[PDB]
Structures are given as C-alpha cells and as structure tokens.
Design a protein around this nucleic acid. Structure first.
Lengths: 135, 80, 77, 203, 83
RNA sequence: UCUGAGAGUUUGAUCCUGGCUCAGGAUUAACGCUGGCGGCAUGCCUAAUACAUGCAAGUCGAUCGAAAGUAGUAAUACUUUAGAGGCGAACGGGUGAGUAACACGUAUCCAAUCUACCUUAUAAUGGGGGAUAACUAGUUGAAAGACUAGCUAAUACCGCAUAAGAACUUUGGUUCGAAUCAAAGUUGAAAGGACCUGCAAGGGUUCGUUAUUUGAUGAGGGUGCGCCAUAUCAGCUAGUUGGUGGGGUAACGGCCUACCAAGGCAAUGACGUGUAGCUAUGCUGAGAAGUAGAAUAGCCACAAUGGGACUGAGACACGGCCCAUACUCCUACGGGAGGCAGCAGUAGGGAAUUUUUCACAAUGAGCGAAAGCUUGAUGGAGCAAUGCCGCG
RNA sequence: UGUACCAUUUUGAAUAAGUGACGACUAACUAUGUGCCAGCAGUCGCGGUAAUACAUAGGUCGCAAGCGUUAUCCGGAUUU
C-alpha cells in the first residue's frame, strides 16, 4: 500500500446551506476520477438549483469515502449534513488528520460555522478555509 | 472417517472416476479407523484382485492394506 | 464457477468446428456412395468410419450401423 | 426430584425405611403416613392399579437417589437383552454405581454417596468417574481414590461397611466387589418392581 | 431367442392389427386386509413375428422383449389353439 | 404367541345404541419459567423465489512454440502456462417444483446400446505435409469489447505406410429372434515429449496416443409382480392402430417418415384430472394396519422456465455455449450480462429451522512420474437444552 | 485442542430450580374472597343463603436443568 506518511483523512468540516455537500461531491469526483467506467462524463459538474438543501445534505452524505490522489490517500467523509449538532461533525473531526472548513462569501450570515470551527480547534488539527459561494 | 468427532470411523468403498465415499460403490472395501492401525475390512486377497482385474480401481488409501496382503506382488506380474 | 468449464468450452468449441468438418466429410462420402453405388465407395466409407471411430468422438456403433445401411443399398443394386 | 434435602420425609411417606432406624427414626418427630394438613383417607378414588404402580415406582427411584431419565435409559438398555423385565430391571437398578457404593457401606446417605462419587474419587474399570453413571456388573471392583481415603465422614462410613449375601467390601483398603445380583430373595421386602412392569401398556 | 422364462401368459382377445394381437391377462392377486383372492384384467400388445399369428379366443404365452411398435413392447411366443 | 388399562357420556333408577375425551412413545420443535457443564446429534415440513457476497474439481510441459524474468555474454539451470491440446468438467451438494413410472423391488430382453482413464492384452508408438494460436502489427474502442493482417511449434490440423485383430461384401457351417465357424471381397492406426547408458543404433526410462479386447464405471428402451387420488369424472383415443420400404439417437422400437391402413383403452369405471420424488430407511401398537420416502444410500427430477447444437464415453450440459421469456449493472443510451432446486446467508410464512463457517489435517475424484491443488464433498467447529444423554 | 483423561493441583457446603395440578377419569388439597358474579376446564363438568376443582397463602405429590403446554401416528374406542 501507500506509505504510512500518506494516510491522511479529511472530513467535511462545515454545515449545509453553505454549498457544503456540493463541494464535498466536487472533491469526491475530483480525487475519484476514473475513466474506464465512463464516470468522467457522469459526474462532470455539480451545482445547485437549490430550493431544498435536505436532499443535498442527505444524498451526498459520504459516511466514509476513501480514494487515492497521486501522493497520498484522501479519505473524504461528509458525515455532517445537519446545520448544528456534534456527532457527525465530531466523528469526522476525530477521523480526519486534516480539515477543510467550507465557508461562504455570498451568505456570510451562516450561523453554525463558529461551533464547527471550535470543535476542530480543540485538537489543533490542520485546517484549510475554503469558500465556494463566490459565484 | 465419519461418525462422532474424536471417535472417527472410516468406511472404505470403491470408485471408478467420479463417485464419493460411502455413497455409490462397486463393493464396500470395509471399515478402518484413521486412529486404528489394523483393519477389519473385507480384504481377503480375492476382492482386491477382483477390483483390479475388473477395472475401476477403488479408493487409494487402503493400498497399504492391500500391499500387506501381497496384492501388488502378484498383480504387477499378472498384468505383465 | 469453475475455470475448467470454460477451458473445456474452448476445447469443445474447437472440437465443434473440427467435428462439423469431419462429420460433413463422412456424410458427403456416404452421399457419394449412395449416388454411385459401388464397392470402392463402400471401402472409402469404411475407411472414413474407421477413422472417426478411432478418433473417439462418437462410438463405433454409429459408424457400423451407417455403413451397414449403405452396404444394404449396395446389395439392393 | 432426583434428589432430596430432607430424606426423612421421603422415607416416612413412602412407607419404606430408606434407613431402618436412621431415617424412620425418633429424632424429635417421627412419622409413617402422609404429613401436613392433608393427612387424610381420601374418599375420592385415589386408589387403583395406577396408584400403587406409581407409589412403588416412587419408593424404588427415591431409595436409589437416581433420576428417572436414567431409569428409562436402564429400561431401554435392558430391552436390548431378552429376558424378564421385572427381575432384570430391579437387579440393574440395584447395580447403580451410587447404590452399590452405598451398599458397600461407604456413605451414610444416598445423597452423600452420589455427591462423593460425582466429586471424582471413585475408580471403576480403571476410570475415576466424574459422573456416577456407570452401571456395575457382578465382580465390578469399585475403588476409593487416594483423596477419599482421608475424608473423615466417608472414613467413618467405610469402617462401618455393610456386607450382604450378594456383595462384599474390604473396608480397610476402601474397596468393594459386587459379588452377585440380588436375584429374588435379597431384595427389600416392602418393595415390588412388578408394578413398574405393569405400569406400561405399550410393551 | 435366448430369452428366459417370465410370466406373461394370457387369453388373446383380438388381432385387428396387422400381425399384432391384443391379449387379455387375468391375474389373481390378494386383498391386503380382508385376505381374499381377487382377479384383475390387463391388456398386452403381442407382436406377431409374421411366421406365427396369434389365433384369437385362446390362451397365448407372451415373453418380454424390446419394443416392436408404438405401445407394442411384446412379441407373441406360444399359442394354444381351439379344440 | 413378543404382546393388550380404564373411567367418565341419557331415564327417578336400569340397561342398550352410538359417539367424544384424557390415560402412550415421539419433535426440523416451539413454547412459559428459569437454567450445569460437556458429549452427542438435530437443525425451513412452508418459499422449486430472485439469488447479492466468497464458495460448489482442479490439475497439467514427462505434449508443444513462445510469453516471462531470477544468475548467466547468450545458450541456458530455473517458475508455470496466457494459448493450442488432456482428463475430470455429468464430480460434488442441493432441494422434490414437478415426476405415480420399470424410476423403483426382482430376473432379465437386450437378438440393439456405448462407456474416456481403468480393465483380459493381442497390436502399436513408420513417415510426414502444412497451418494455428503464443508472438507481431493495424483497427474500432471510456471500458465492455472488437475486426483485419501475417509467422511458427507440438501430443496441434490433415492423408498415407504396417495394421494381428478388426469393421464390412459373396459362399458354406452352425444355432432358439439370433447366438456360433470355414472360404473369400473391400478397407483403413497416429505422434511422439522427456531421463540415464550407449558414437549412433540399441538397451533401460517416464509420459501421450493407437487398435484389439475381459469387464467395471454411468446409463439407454422394454420388462411379469406391486407402485396416490380421481363416477358429485363414461366414454376417451386420428401415428389412434399396426404393416412393407427408407431414414434414425447408443440402439430394437411408427423412434420418425413415404406408402398401406381403422383401429387401440375401457363398467374389475376407460380417458381426463391434479398430486406424492420410488425402495431401504421414520414411529405407534401384539396385530391388523396407519403414519414420510422430506434430506439421505441407490435410482430419479429440475437444476431461472423452454428449446437448439457441440464436446465428452456418457450433457443437448446448475455453476459450458447460443437463444426466447423474468431480471439486471454501469453509460456518452452506442453497448455488453448471469444464476445457491451447491454450500451458507439473505427476503418472507411460520414457532423456528444452523456459519453471510475453518483445513483439505484424514477420506473422493480429477489430473500431474512427482512436489501436489481445490472442493461450501469430507472431516471439524459454531449454532439453538436444538433433542438425547449424565452429572450436581 | 492447553480438547479429551489424570492427579481434594487449592478454599469451601459451597456453583445452579422450575412446572402441572391435589374431586374422579389420572398421583398430587386444607383454609381464605367469591352467590353460577369472580374465574376453572381434555370428559364428567366446577361457583346462584358459609368454597379442599375457581383466585390466593400455603402443604402436597409427579418429576427436573429441565420442568408443563400444545403439535404429530397408532393402541388403549372390536366404539367400522
């Protein structure tokens, strides 16, 4: 298998209404690009026509999705789909060796990213702030 | 072997090319336990010759029991 | 699933082609005998049937019966 | 019950002394009938062949201290051998390992004998029995293991061993030989197994 | 034929078929419970080999063999003629 | 003979007629209550419904060219065969949908039938020609797949040599629908790979094939005997019924057909009808008999239903192939796909019916000189007092 | 399978109890509420001016790590 240094887990460290699961599916398709099955033209683009976000939160929820990306193994885990709670976000945080914080620019009024950030800041785990609402 | 565990009972039967143990047999070779070094099998230097001369050699685990009876010492020259 | 089943599938499909060819040759020899009825074609049919019985595809009974039916027509001529 | 916990009750109510003057004994109270508030000659028809067959079966399988499932197992095993059901069945029941150990005079009580033989200290056929289920035969040597040659209760019992015209015991070496079957005259006088013979109608 | 003994004797009934006879066999078996002998009737198709023809209204002995025609799985063997 | 239970049910009371109940072994059990162990054996009757998942016979170079690399300059010592070709693939196991019958129990007709290795051993492995995969190239391709172009080996495809014996023509002989032999016509067996000695030949040496030939092996059609229900089902049946000729599966057989035909079964209730897998084995009783043939040993049947063909000796082939019908994944909507009535296990009904089971250790086959491999067969084990057994 | 069997290998009475029903058929029953109400029950059948069949406390017997229950074939019903 890949080296021990290259076993890094990443849980989607955010909440819905932030374009969260859209970004989770985008990352999953980007690092899970396989062409022998034709998936490249099956999940090419991901974007919302959003009148419901529960569908985005549930259908895209990745309880444990592991792939490999040239240098390492990327373990994308979109357990959280709730706006505010602790179990899924906390298990994602425990699993992940690094965190991606999905934030917003179009809707900066999202209320439930403070507690998510505080949870991730307990273990000092590395975090990358990524904003996708800039469109 | 068969029966009850740690008390095995081996029933030796005949075969041509496909059949199992103690199912469809040309003739029951006899009874030997894997834990018992002496057989009460139906072995009398005659049934073994019958099975060899009729073709369809029986199971290949009582050959030593037939070897002790000298079956090969006569058959390998009878065929010759 | 057993890989040997597909292995014997490969072997038996090639045998299918070869035996189709050989049985068609035997049946056309039989047809030639039944057209020009003579002892020479009877011997040719005998040789072909002996070859097929030696190959071991179908038992020699079919060869013997077909050649007996051919030589019956021979006696009818 | 294959057991007890007050044997004197069973001995008194069954009408048969499991111990002659040590179970129907003046130890305070002493009885010979059914005790309690229901000591009564039942005017209801509680008496028939069925009733006395049951009662004799109770007496016999409660003097042995053995279970009824092994009673039926012994019956079935004897059924493999042709003969007479009554005498053979009673003789095999008497030949019980615990029953014979008691007959040797190796334990003051059948329950205690059963407990001791189960404890893994009785040698028969060179096998120290961890379960007293081995039915004896005439000449079966029961030996007392090295453990039970230092146990005070069974020491006192063995030193007071009982000899009968169909067994014998060497109490000093703590050993016993089942000399012969009790055929028809060495059986208890108030006990009759023929009722258990007639207790079946599917022979 | 080397064919050995087997019981197929019966009273031949008809020969309306070209060298083929229908034979009536009256076989007595035993009642399983009340234990009385009762007879039953069976029909058999005996093939007349061309050199022998089953004369009807008589008893004939049939013997087992491989089939000769459709539902004709017997050949006629012996006949007792009229008197 | 081993052997056999009674009482209760009616009129004020009596009896009679008749009936019902408990009183017995026993569980694919379940069930309340609780619970000692282990041994031991049991474990969808109903669901034959799809079967997801692993798994349900693999072995082969001592058959071959090369692939393919470890050490070697390479040759090669070396690893197996992708592929051609060999056997087993039908084994095994499963359930019994359906199947009531020669399938069965039994002696057989097989005069009609083969059986690969094996087997009774007589005959052979003489000699080739040329392919074909492997290899290589291009093509369609997301893959699935996929066509074209060539080269070459063998145990590979295709003739002949010899070829006893033998298939098979004509005559004689013999014989209870043919047994047996003489004369005599026709006619055909490939293929060699590998190891020691020997220059080689040859000898030893191991595989692969060849005929002939005693049987087993699995089974073929019929077969007397018996083989569920079916009258609140009486007529049913046009290969129906049989014949000559011809063709035919392994073969006799209207097996099937051209021709020639009108008959066949049947009130002992024909035909039809649906069902049960049949024998041994499973209980009760003294007996009469009843109770299943689930699973199982043999046989038999499907193996998702219905066909076709090929192989194999045996299949028109559960886990080969093609297809129609049920289904399905992914997809760019172009396309390809298969079956646990195999083991389990899943879904259900039910009271419930076991591991989403381990090694082939021992046992089966298969094959390899051999190392051996796999078995979900086997042997274990779990599993639920699941049942028995004994124990405190 | 450190399984099986061995040796109080060591302390100890300690480590295990439930079921039916007691009127008969067919062993196991005395009292308390209960007026044919409560509830029992396979047959007889149980309770309507003092309940041992009901419900219970209890004692009782049959058993037993299985206990009772229904299930299922014959015989006890010659009572086809």
């Amino acid at each position: 298998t890949v080296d021990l240094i290259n076993f890094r887990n990443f849980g989607i460290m955010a909440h819905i209404d932030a374009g969260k699961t859209t970004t989770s599916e985008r990352i999953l398709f980007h690092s899970g690009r396989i062409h022998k099955i034709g998936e490249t033209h099956d999940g090419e683009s991901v974007m919302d026509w959003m009148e419901q976000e529960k569908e985005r939160g549930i259908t895209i929820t990745s309880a444990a999705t592991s792939v490999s990306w040239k240098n390492c193994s990327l373990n994308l885990i979109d357990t959280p789909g709730h706006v505010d709670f602790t179990v899924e976000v906390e298990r994602s945080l425990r699993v992940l060796d690094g965190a991606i914080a999905v934030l917003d620019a179009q809707m900066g009024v999202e209320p439930q990213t403070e507690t998510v950030w505080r949870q991730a800041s307990r273990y000092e785990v590395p975090r990358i702030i990524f904003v996708n609402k800039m469109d | 072997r068969m029966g009850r565990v740690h008390y095995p009972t081996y029933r030796i039967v005949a075969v041509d090319s496909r059949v199992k143990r103690d199912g469809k047999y040309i003739a029951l070779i006899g009874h030997l336990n894997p834990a018992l070094k002496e057989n009460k099998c139906k072995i009398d230097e005659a049934v073994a010759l019958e099975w060899l001369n009729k073709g369809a050699k029986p199971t290949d685990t009582v050959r030593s029991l037939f070897s002790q009876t000298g079956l090969w010492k006569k058959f390998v020259e009878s065929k010759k | 699933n057993i890989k040997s089943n597909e292995k014997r599938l490969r072997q038996n499909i090639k045998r299918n082609l070869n035996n189709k060819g050989q049985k068609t040759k035997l049946k056309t020899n039989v047809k030639n005998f039944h057209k020009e009825i003579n002892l020479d074609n009877l011997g040719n049919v005998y040789s072909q049937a002996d070859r097929l019985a030696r190959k071991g595809i179908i038992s020699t009974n079919r060869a013997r019966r077909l050649k007996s039916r051919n030589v019956a027509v021979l006696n009818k001529t | 019950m294959k057991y007890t916990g007050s044997i004197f009750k069973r001995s008194r109510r069954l009408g048969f002394s499991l111990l002659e003057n040590n179970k129907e004994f003046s130890k305070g109270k002493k009885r010979k009938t059914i005790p309690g508030q229901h000591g009564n000659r039942f005017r209801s028809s509680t008496m028939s062949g069925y009733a006395q067959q049951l009662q004799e079966k109770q007496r016999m399988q409660y003097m042995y201290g053995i279970t009824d499932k092994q009673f039926r197992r012994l019956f079935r095993l004897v059924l493999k051998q042709r003969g007479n059901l009554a005498v053979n069945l009673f003789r095999v029941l008497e030949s019980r390992l615990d029953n014979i150990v008691y007959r040797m005079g190796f334990a003051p009580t059948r329950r205690s004998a059963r407990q001791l033989v189960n404890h893994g200290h009785v040698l028969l056929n060179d096998r120290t029995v961890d379960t007293p289920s081995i039915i004896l035969n005439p000449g079966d040597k029961v030996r007392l293991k090295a453990k039970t040659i230092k146990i005070p209760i069974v020491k006192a019992a063995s030193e007071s061993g009982v000899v009968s015209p169909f067994v014998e015991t060497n109490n000093k070496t703590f050993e016993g030989t089942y000399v012969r079957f009790p055929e028809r005259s060495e059986l208890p006088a108030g006990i009759n197994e023929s009722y258990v013979v007639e207790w079946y109608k599917r022979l | 034929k080397r064919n050995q003994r087997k019981v197929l004797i019966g009273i031949v009934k008809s020969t309306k078929n070209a060298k083929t006879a229908t034979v009536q066999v009256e076989s007595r078996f035993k009642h399983p419970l009340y234990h009385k002998s009762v007879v039953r009737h069976k029909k058999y198709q005996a093939h007349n080999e061309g050199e022998v023809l089953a004369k009807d209204g008589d008893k004939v002995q049939i013997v087992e063999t491989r089939p000769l025609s459709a539902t004709k799985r017997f050949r006629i063997a012996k006949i007792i003629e009229r008197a």
